[PDB]
Design a protein around this ligand. Structure first.
Ligand code: HEM
Length: 85
């Protein structure tokens, strides 16, 4: 299978509105175009851009519909050596 992998070092560089990546559950999402659409606003996303936002994403209690949106932004998996517990 042709899965794309990213190191966290790479993901961390995509930390502004120019190109915004985020890790949730060991996957990388490019949410650049979603910033202006996110119901929770842009700032909560930018504050964790380039980082692992799993804990915040889960703590907010996002709906099943919100979760299903992730397929629009998925760009690859975190490299296995860089996965969080
Ligand atoms: C790709 C990532 C994300 C997607 C697709 C997403 C999607 C959504 C959606 C659909 C809503 C509307 C409410 C719902 O359906 O549950 C929402 C609201 C909200 N989101 Fe997100 N979200 C993402 C990431 C985040 C993150 C990382 C945070 C916090 C750091 C956050 C904070 C909030 C807040 C505060 C609201 C409104 C208040 C609430 O729903 O309790 N979101 N988001």
């Amino acid at each position: 299978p042709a899965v794309t992998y990213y190191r966290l070092e790479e993901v961390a560089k995509r930390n502004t509105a120019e190109e915004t990546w985020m890790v949730i559950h060991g996957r990388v999402y490019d949410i650049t175009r979603f910033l202006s659409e996110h119901p929770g606003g842009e700032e909560v996303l930018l504050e964790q851009a380039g980082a692992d936002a799993t804990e915040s994403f889960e703590d907010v209690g996002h709906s099943p519909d919100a979760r299903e949106m992730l397929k629009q932004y998925y760009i690859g998996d975190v490299h296995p050596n860089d996965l969080k517990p």
